[PDB]
Design a protein around this ligand. Structure first.
Ligand SMILES: Nc1ncnc2c1ncn2[C@@H]1O[C@H](COP(=O)(O)OP(=O)(O)OP(=O)(O)O)[C@@H](O)[C@H]1O
Ligand SMILES: Nc1ncnc2c1ncn2[C@@H]1O[C@H](COP(=O)(O)OP(=O)(O)O)[C@@H](O)[C@H]1O
Ligand SMILES: [Mg+2]
Ligand SMILES: [Mg+2]
Lengths: 373, 829, 136, 371, 264
């Protein structure tokens, strides 16, 4: 009935769309201008007044100033309708025009595609109150990551240093990534996830660069929350033995540490270090001057298991009444990820029973199956 | 092939069926019990081609034969069980649904859920095919509905139950089954009635929803649906209960914000505070308090709102004054106020008229104290244009401001009868817009007698009609209709096709806005008015009369009337504007109405081309999406000056009170490009002003309450402005340009002060994110997209909602907006 | 050691090392220079880079004693809103090989710990737990 | 109600568009002339000698375009462009004089997809899969009906399983079931093996892994068939020798791709393993991988079915009886049965008789048996 | 013309100013291997029906694994002579990067001629040069011989009666995709040493020179026992060198003895 009505009406829509296409006719082929008009004569004229090249300014020698510019053609130029002389900066991207080469427009700095898309400006879809079994850990993380930011005058009155650096560690799967996502979503600051694999490249020179540009980007931004993951992958025991050929990763780790805290302030950057094997981590990095508030995620207790159970039960089609504390009791030594998989198994059991209700019986069957496997 | 176990199971089932030819020993009760056992097995098993079925095809006919064979008794329904299952799989559209279900009432344990689904479908379609007859066979349908609804409510299929009820016209049935768990689901489902097929017949959906809400004591949203149903009597009845002080104050806040005028005196508890809440006396103080929180009380020079550094006739002087008034909304410009006041006072020239005084009125909008005081101490004297400026400033200050005191009404009634035609026009405009939507009768009785404007100008007649239309705001006031009729009698052959003639149609449509079936009498009066006229404004009459409809019968009528080519295209313009004025709600419908309007602009006459951008603004008011901005810029750089005017103002409107950086950059680039066009530069300046309305604190919006509530006064003002801009060249680029002030009166904010009990500004952390259309999705959908915890003093956005926090407080409303209260009673921390 | 022949990148590091050696050992007085080197892998380093015209006076950083730990914690607590009651020396004793910045990290953690409740005093044992069955 | 909404508005579309557009077409003029005018104006917008490479985009109307000579030049784009196709690294078209961005054209990509996607619909289908009904139904539940019927999961609440492991001895139709899933499903299956991702140098393996995952997400919501991984990583060891450390990094990247910080599309992972006890305990984490499936050796009846399905395209002789081969109660995978059939056929061909014989099948049995 | 006669790889003239195309520019002892190959190659070619009742496909790809000088040549000659079907040879690195872009087109023409001369024997000696194990970089992202391999596999799979003989010196390097079903399937190895094989190869490669009678090539083959194949060709060439050094064109047993001694 309803399904057939759907099929009919969607057939009508497909027919309408093809009819529109054939009747009027809009396509691109190779390049196109489908949006009507788009006349851009003034655009051409101002492009001629512009369409400038860019390079990297080097030095402003004199106090009319002498800007020095380097690309496939060196140059020494200055002056422009632009003001804020060299925007009080030298190593920018100048953006200078042709035709006597003295008119400029400042540009941001070039950055490799890797970091460009590692910026990860997206907001993960997680929020607090969806976390159970690690109330103490989340309390610690909330304190460290928010008190310096949210009404932090109370945090400065006491004359106490602001902690900077937290390493999340624990068994594989405890809601560490979940809590990282939640903090990312809630926070309002330059957030930057980092993947360890992207820091391993073809021979020396790559990781150290990308790390340095990442760090200067964070410094340029007002306040950064960096989110290293795969720290187990990036940075390990400094010992060489046979790693005399593999010293590249160790080198990159060394530069990472130096930028974290070397002979220069590191800045308003708070670091999150995701891991599950917090022993091979190098001592220099693990130094508490760089990872202040290491947090440990443990297997949830009964209350945490129940809270995670109801959280996952947030979904609909579930039974009207379930007895979650017994569910948790039946699943001891179970990760929150295992609670999630138990809810998934209950849903799949409902489907394989052709039932639109997820019953406590379905939950019990799922628990039995997961326990047996 | 088949498996041996299978083939044996069938063989046994058939052999049973053939031996079934009469009632005897195992034949009737035990053999049919065997069959029902296999049916129970089939339902319990998978939807995987149950073995008993798909092989007993002639056996369906044989079971029918056995049914008509055995005499009545214990049989005739226990076999009807088997017959009805074989029907569902094969046949028996209604016969089985009737007799088998008359047997074994409900209790569909041995049948599963698909059985229940298809019986529901068959019953609904049987009711559909049964016209207003078959009462004897309809009572069984009522019993069927009673049987089916509670099981559906239990299982999970409340959406299917809602379907059943809608297509069976059983709105007032579930009132006895709704539960404390499913009330939200059913209420949301009822609210989601964009087809509202019953509504043109009658608001049965709203009726049952309001019954449920009053039964469950959810007064806020009960009142929301009460307003949705245009019956002030019903709204008053809902508000009457007043069993809780907190909820009473909350619903008073909603009534005041919507501007619906309550009626009572010193006769009930909390009468004074409820009256103040509804009157909105505290709105200005609360707005100023929020501004102080993150103080924004900094006057900005027109260029500062612009960025002229990045690179003075009446025209640009007034344009800059308008920009300043838009950006500084109720912020008390004070020093910059006086500076620009002296500037435009010196620049008083041609159109350097009361306009700028009304601008000061906007800067002091809702500032009854500051605005009235400032205008009184520095205004009036000579220059009847300056006195009209004072009158309109008072009107603006009082716009949407309710109070028994009549600071605007008294003055404008005093100076209504002054001979000066333009000053009287301004006075009447101020009077209308000061209490636009109040719907009272004092000013109507004071104005309708002076509707007769044979001694005055037709523009005065039209603007007075618009004032009465503001007041009536859809009341279909018979007095308004009568005075419009005498105006038509006073009408002239040529005055219609000169300018401003649309105002009288505009006022009639205001009086009869989206009434419903009264649009029939509206068209009757349209045919009654047989003036020597080129229709068109009659089309506007009908258009502004019918509105708020998600269906497209009037939409197709208007589309075809415009489609007939007019090789007098203002008729098509009003037709497209009416298409917009019908499609304003449903998001997909609005998007695709914009697509259709783009089709119109591309394959349309220049008249339709000038018309389209206004309709685009109507659809996307204060909703500057990238695609719509691209289109509006595209057709604002058009060669035709009128097209460019319409598109530039439409883009300013879609950017209204948003301050989007991309929009502002595009705006300034377009201003640079149109460097030699004075009127275009004026309009672009007003466009920046719109982009910066109250520095992005006040946003006019027809829709409201999570895209649920219709703003009657807002639609009135917006439609006035857009009708005025239908012909920008003559209507605006000339004498009259104060319909923008009408829009200003129509203005309103978007803001989330959590002023708790006793208006205490209790702060709270609120997670805000773009809406997600909670309907249908899994569990309790995360309405918040991109959680941005930002305390209480937030501004939300065109389409984002809030979720507060875990359990800190209990809001009195789940549609958080404007003035709200947060009960400090968490169940447990 | 400069002789290991693992693979590429190695040899680049050896040219850079040899460039360093040149820059201070060649036909150049290099009078107006002061090189100060910093390393932690003390043992594994180039025998020529080692010293005697290149990196002499190889100052050594030892593990702080109890007194040194007391002094460092005092230094980091100087600006700390410490109450007029401290067992600094006994906290240094508790350190028990707490050499590195751990002292600073602990003073910060103590600040946060007191800030749980808004205090200005040292519990002296919640301080150890900030520091960081069967028998006993 | 939702059906009512969609039907109502859909009819609105048909009526609105069809009627008005057909009215305009009946008065066809005022469209073709404008279209030709616009097309010739675009042509007028310089189309000499022209090409461009897009390094990045600043914002609307402004972007940086680099030429083969490194002509990095920044230019204000011309709106005539298609827009939204300006992904960094795209091949842009630039005016010879002003280097105005007016067009973009790549129409050519890395053939990695064409290499790792071969014979998308192999000759083996579920009919060719003789037996293993339980495993077949479970894998369908895990993979297909989530995609072919994205309604049940959506209405009930959960999302489908992401990673599914198939573990069993060396040869039990794992790749066969992968192929059948590919053929039956409309999605662009992806074959992958464990002996190629082990790259010569650091970062190469994880780089190609990430590229493979991104390709899977982009081109199609499909399956990725990761064959043996025990040769990779085998859990996270003490991480001492450089090669194994790098391979552990590769698995950790795999783990991030399987379930990372950001998100995951509608791409399902299917693992095939000879041995499972040795795999990373963390990788199989129930949040990431679920529905580990035994793929054991066929029993006697499964062996009958496998012989029958293999030999369906094999005109067995009247004397040839396929029961002496079921006789052997020892290790005989589906691959073993295929080898037996092929060896019998080849030996019959060698001994020149067009028809296979029971003795030929016997000899094939002895010469296919390894131990 | 509208590229009416221009494949998208050809020279064309472009005006200096206002660039414009114009005036298009123009361009013994190997019995077991002999048998094995004879069956596997001709039986499918000669009697395709021998697989219809089998309900299987005709084998269409064989791969030889030989030493440097031994095999891969005598067997190819025997197949060409004893098989009437066309014997095309693209031996050597006939797809090496020497000519890129047009290498794919040369593969196209190879397939075209193979289809035309159906059945055909596409001899391809030393695939190792073009056919190295698919690994390292590219993995399908490279436009090099890896791209050529991908194109070859795509074109292959389907052959009806054509047959393909890959050959290489080392089996160590191989491609999983190529060796997978639907592509080169069967394999066979070669034995380096044989007295009769060495003697006959000696005669064959000494054929193109003025030899003198009264000479025991049997003795020479025996006296060069630890000898490979092309090694024998080098032996013959150095024997010619010694014949020249003797200042006479009478290539003699003395010259062959001296050349064998120098070679060993
Ligand atoms: N406290 C929790 N509350 C809710 N869900 C949780 C919690 N802990 C774990 N889970 C569930 O476990 C899975 C979280 O995996 P996540 O990636 O965040 O873990 P992790 O600790 O970072 O480690 P791993 O990467 O080894 O899985 C999801 O299923 C999440 O639902
Ligand atoms: N139902 C089946 N179960 C297992 N193997 C089968 C089945 N049907 C056919 N086969 C045979 O199994 C072989 C494939 O096994 P494969 O997937 O390679 O195992 P593995 O991947 O463990 O090596 C094919 O040659 C096919 O003929
Ligand atoms: Mg995790
Ligand atoms: Mg396999």
């Amino acid at each position: 009935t309803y399904s057939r009505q759907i099929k009919q009406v969607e057939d009508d829509i497909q027919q309408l769309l093809k009819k529109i296409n054939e009747l009027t006719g809009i396509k691109e082929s190779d390049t196109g201008l489908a949006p009507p008009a788009l006349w851009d004569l003034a655009a051409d004229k101002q492009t001629l007044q512009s369409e400038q090249p860019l390079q990297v300014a080097r030095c402003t020698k004199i106090i009319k100033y002498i800007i020095n510019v380097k690309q496939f053609a060196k140059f020494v130029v200055d002056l422009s309708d632009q003001v804020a002389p060299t925007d009080i900066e030298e190593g920018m991207r100048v953006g200078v025009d042709r035709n006597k080469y003295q008119i400029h427009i400042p540009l941001p700095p070039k950055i490799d595609p890797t970091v460009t898309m590692m910026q990860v400006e997206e907001k993960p879809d997680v929020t607090y109150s969806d976390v159970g079994g690690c109330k103490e850990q989340i309390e610690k993380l909330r304190e460290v990551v928010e008190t310096p930011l949210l009404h932090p005058e109370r945090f400065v009155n006491l004359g106490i240093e602001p902690p900077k650096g937290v390493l999340l560690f624990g068994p594989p799967g405890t809601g560490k990534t979940l809590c990282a996502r939640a903090v990312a979503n809630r926070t309002d600051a330059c957030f930057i996830r980092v993947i360890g694999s992207e820091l391993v490249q073809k021979y020396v020179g790559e990781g150290a660069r990308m790390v340095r540009e990442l760090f200067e980007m964070a410094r340029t931004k007002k306040a950064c929350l960096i989110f290293f993951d795969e720290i187990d992958a990036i940075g390990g025991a400094r010992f060489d033995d046979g790693a005399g050929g593999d010293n590249e990763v160790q080198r990159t780790m060394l530069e990472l540490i130096n930028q974290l805290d070397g002979f220069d302030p590191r800045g308003n950057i708070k670091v999150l270090m995701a891991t599950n094997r917090p022993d091979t981590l190098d001592p220099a990095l693990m130094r508490p001057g760089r990872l202040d508030r290491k947090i440990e995620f443990s297997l949830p207790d009964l209350e945490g298991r129940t809270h995670i159970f109801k959280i996952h039960a947030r979904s609909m089609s579930v039974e009207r009444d379930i007895r979650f504390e017994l569910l948790a009791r039946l699943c001891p030594n179970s990760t929150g990820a295992e609670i999630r998989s138990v809810c998934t198994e209950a849903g799949m059991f409902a489907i394989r029973a052709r039932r639109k209700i997820a019953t406590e019986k379905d939950f019990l069957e799922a628990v039995n199956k997961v326990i047996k496997s | 092939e088949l498996s041996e176990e299978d083939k044996q199971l069938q063989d046994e089932l058939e052999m049973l069926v053939e031996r079934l030819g009469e009632k005897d020993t195992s034949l009737y009760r035990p053999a049919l019990e065997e069959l029902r056992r296999q049916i129970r097995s089939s339902t319990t098993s998978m939807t995987s081609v149950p073995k008993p079925l798909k092989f007993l095809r002639p056996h369906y006919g044989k079971l029918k034969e056995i049914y008509e064979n055995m005499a009545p008794g214990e049989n005739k329904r226990f076999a009807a069980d088997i017959i009805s299952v074989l029907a569902m799989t094969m046949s028996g559209e209604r016969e089985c649904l009737k007799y088998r279900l008359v047997g074994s009432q409900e209790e569909l344990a041995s049948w599963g859920h698909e059985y229940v689904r298809h019986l529901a479908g068959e019953v609904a379609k049987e009711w559909q095919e049964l016209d207003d007859a078959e009462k004897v066979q309809r009572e069984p349908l009522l019993t069927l509905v009673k049987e089916i609804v509670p099981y559906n409510m239990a299982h999970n299929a409340e959406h299917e139950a809602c379907d059943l009820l809608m297509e069976i016209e059983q709105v007032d049935m579930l009132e006895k089954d709704i539960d404390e768990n499913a009330y939200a689901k059913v209420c949301l489902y009822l609210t989601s009635c964009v087809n509202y097929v019953p509504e043109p017949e009658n608001s049965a959906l709203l009726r049952c929803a309001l019954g449920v809400f009053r039964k469950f004591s959810r007064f806020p949203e009960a009142l929301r649906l009460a307003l949705m149903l245009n019956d002030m009597e019903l709204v008053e009845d809902i508000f009457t209960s007043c069993k809780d002080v907190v909820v009473q104050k909350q619903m008073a806040f909603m009534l005041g914000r919507h501007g619906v005028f309550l009626e009572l005196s010193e006769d009930v508890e909390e009468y004074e505070d409820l009256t103040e809440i509804m009157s909105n006396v505290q709105l200005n103080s609360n707005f100023l308090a929020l501004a102080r929180e993150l103080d924004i009380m900094e006057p900005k020079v027109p260029d500062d709102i612009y960025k002229t550094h990045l690179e003075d006739s009446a025209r640009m002087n007034l344009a800059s004054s308008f920009v300043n008034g838009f950006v500084n909304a109720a912020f008390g410009q004070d020093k910059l106020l006086t500076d620009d006041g002296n500037k435009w006072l010196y620049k008083n020239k041609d159109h350097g008229m009361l306009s700028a005084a009304a601008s000061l009125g906007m800067i002091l909008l809702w500032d009854v104290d500051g605005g009235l005081t400032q205008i009184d101490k520095y205004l009036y004297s000579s220059e009847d244009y300056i006195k009209s400026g004072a009158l309109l400033a008072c009107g603006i200050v009082n716009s949407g401001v309710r109070n028994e005191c009549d600071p605007a009404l008294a003055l404008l009634s005093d100076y209504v009868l002054h001979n000066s035609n333009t000053m009287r026009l301004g006075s009447i405009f101020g009077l209308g817009l000061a209490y636009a939507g109040s719907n009272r009768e004092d000013v109507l009785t004071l104005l309708l007698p002076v509707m007769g404007d044979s001694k005055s100008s037709m523009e005065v007649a039209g603007v007075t009609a618009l004032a009465c239309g503001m007041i009536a705001v859809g009341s279909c006031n018979g007095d308004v209709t009568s005075t419009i009729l005498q105006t038509i009698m006073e009408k002239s052959e040529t005055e219609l096709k000169d300018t401003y003639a649309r105002w009288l149609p505009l006022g009639l449509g205001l009086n009869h806005l989206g009434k419903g079936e009264a649009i029939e009498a509206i068209l009757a009066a349209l045919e009654v008015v047989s003036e020597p006229f080129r229709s068109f404004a009659n089309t506007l009459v009908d258009v502004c009369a019918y509105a708020g409809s998600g269906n497209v019968l009037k939409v197709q009528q208007l589309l075809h009337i415009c489609s007939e080519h007019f090789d007098m295209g203002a008729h098509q313009g009003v037709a497209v504007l009416g298409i917009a004025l019908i499609a304003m709600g449903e998001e997909i419908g609005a998007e695709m109405a914009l697509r259709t309007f783009g089709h119109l602009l591309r394959y349309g006459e220049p008249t339709l081309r000038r018309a389209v951008p206004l309709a685009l603004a109507l659809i996307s008011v204060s909703n500057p999406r990238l695609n719509i901005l691209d289109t509006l810029s595209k057709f604002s750089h058009d060669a035709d000056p009128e097209v460019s005017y319409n598109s530039i103002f439409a883009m300013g409107m879609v950017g209204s009170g948003t301050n989007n950086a991309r929009l502002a950059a595009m705006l300034r680039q377009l201003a640079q490009y149109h460097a030699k066009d004075p009127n275009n530069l004026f309009m672009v300046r007003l466009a920046q002003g719109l982009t910066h309305l109250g520095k992005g604190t006040l946003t006019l919006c027809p829709y409201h309450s999570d895209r649920q509530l219709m703003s009657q006064v807002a639609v009135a003002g917006l439609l006035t402005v857009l009708v005025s801009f239908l012909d920008v060249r003559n209507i605006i680029l000339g004498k009259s340009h104060y319909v923008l002030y009408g829009l200003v009166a129509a203005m309103q904010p978007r803001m989330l002060v959590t002023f708790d009990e006793e208006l205490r500004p209790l702060p709270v952390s609120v997670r805000v994110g773009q809406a997600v259309d909670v309907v249908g999705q899994a569990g309790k959908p995360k309405t918040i997209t991109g959680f941005q915890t930002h305390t209480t003093p937030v501004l939300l956005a065109h389409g984002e909602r809030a979720e507060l926090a875990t359990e800190e407080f209990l809001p009195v409303t789940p549609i958080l907006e404007g003035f709200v209260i947060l009960r400090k009673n968490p169940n447990y921390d | 050691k400069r002789f290991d022949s693992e693979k590429a990148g190695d040899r680049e590091v050896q040219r850079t090392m040899l460039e360093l050696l040149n820059q201070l050992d060649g036909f150049q007085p290099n009078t107006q220079v002061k090189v100060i080197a910093a390393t932690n892998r003390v043992d594994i380093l180039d025998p020529a880079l080692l010293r005697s015209g290149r990196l002499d006076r190889k100052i050594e950083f030892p593990m702080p004693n109890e007194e040194a730990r007391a002094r460092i914690m005092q230094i980091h607590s100087r600006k700390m809103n410490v109450s007029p009651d401290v067992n600094y020396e006994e906290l240094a004793r508790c350190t028990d090989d707490f050499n590195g910045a751990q002292c600073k990290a602990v003073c910060v953690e103590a600040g946060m710990i007191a800030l749980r409740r808004g205090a200005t005093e040292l519990t002296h044992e919640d301080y150890m737990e900030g520091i960081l069955q069967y028998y006993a | 109600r939702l059906k009512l909404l969609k039907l109502e508005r859909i009819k609105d579309y048909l009526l609105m568009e069809e009627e008005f557009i057909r009215n305009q077409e009946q008065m066809k003029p005022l469209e073709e002339k404008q279209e030709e005018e616009r097309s010739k104006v675009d042509d007028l917008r310089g189309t000499p000698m022209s090409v461009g490479t897009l390094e990045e985009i600043i914002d609307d109307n402004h972007a940086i375009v680099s030429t083969s000579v490194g002509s990095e030049h920044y230019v204000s784009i011309l709106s005539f462009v298609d827009k939204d196709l300006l992904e960094p690294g795209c091949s842009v078209l630039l005016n010879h004089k002003v280097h105005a961005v007016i067009g973009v054209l790549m129409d050519d990509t890395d053939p990695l997809v064409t290499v790792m996607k071969v014979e998308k619909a192999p000759q083996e289908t579920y009919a060719d899969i003789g037996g293993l009904d339980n495993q077949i139904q479970e894998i369908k539940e895990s993979v297909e009906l989530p995609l072919t019927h994205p309604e049940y999961y959506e209405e009930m609440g959960i999302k489908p399983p992401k990673g599914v492991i198939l573990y069993g001895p060396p040869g039990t139709g794992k790749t066969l079931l992968a192929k059948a899933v590919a053929n039956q499903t409309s999605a662009t299956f992806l074959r992958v093996v464990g002996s190629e991702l082990i790259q010569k140098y650091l970062g190469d393996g994880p780089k190609l892994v990430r590229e493979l995952f991104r390709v899977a997400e982009e081109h199609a919501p499909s399956i990725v068939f990761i064959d043996e991984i025990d040769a990779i990583g085998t859990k996270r060891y003490d991480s001492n020798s450089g090669g194994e450390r790098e391979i552990q990094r590769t698995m950790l990247e795999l783990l991030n791709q399987l379930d990372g910080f950001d998100s995951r599309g509608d791409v399902k992972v299917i693992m095939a393993t000879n041995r499972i006890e040795t795999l990373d305990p963390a990788l199989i984490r129930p949040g990431r991988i679920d529905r580990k499936i035994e793929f054991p050796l066929p029993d006697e009846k499964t062996k009958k079915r496998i012989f029958q399905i293999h030999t369906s395209r094999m005109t067995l002789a009247d004397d040839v009886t396929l029961d002496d081969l079921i006789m052997a109660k020892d290790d005989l995978s589906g691959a073993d049965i295929k080898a037996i059939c092929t060896e019998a056929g080849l030996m019959a061909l060698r001994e020149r008789r067009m028809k296979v014989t029971n003795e030929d099948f016997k000899k094939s049995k002895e010469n296919v048996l390894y131990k | 013309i509208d590229i009416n006669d221009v494949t998208p790889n050809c020279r064309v003239a472009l005006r200096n100013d206002s660039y414009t195309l114009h005036k298009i520019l123009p361009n013994g002892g190997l019995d077991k291997q002999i048998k094995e190959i004879k069956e596997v190659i001709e039986l499918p070619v000669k009697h395709p029906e021998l697989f219809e009742a089998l309900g299987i496909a005709q084998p269409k790809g064989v791969l030889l694994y030989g030493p440097p000088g031994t095999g891969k040549t005598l067997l190819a000659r025997a197949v060409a002579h004893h098989t009437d079907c066309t014997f095309i040879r693209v031996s050597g690195s006939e797809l090496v990067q020497k000519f890129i872009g047009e290498g794919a087109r040369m593969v196209r023409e190879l397939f075209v001629m193979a289809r035309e001369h159906a059945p055909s024997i596409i001899f391809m000696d030393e695939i190792d040069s073009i056919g190295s194990s698919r690994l390292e970089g590219g993995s399908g992202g490279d436009s090099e011989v890896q791209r050529t391999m991908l194109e070859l596999l795509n074109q292959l799979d389907a052959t009806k009666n054509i047959k393909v003989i890959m050959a290489t010196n080392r089996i160590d390097i191989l491609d999983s995709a190529l060796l997978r079903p639907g592509r080169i399937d069967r394999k066979i190895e070669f034995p380096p040493p044989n007295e009769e094989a060495r003697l006959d190869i000696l005669k064959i490669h000494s054929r193109k020179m003025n030899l003198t009678r009264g000479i025991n090539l049997r003795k020479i083959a025996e006296l060069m026992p630890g000898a490979s194949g092309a090694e024998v060709k080098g032996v013959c060439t150095e024997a010619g060198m010694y014949a020249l050094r003797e200042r006479r064109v009478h290539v003699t047993q003395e010259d062959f003895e001296m050349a064998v001694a120098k070679v060993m």
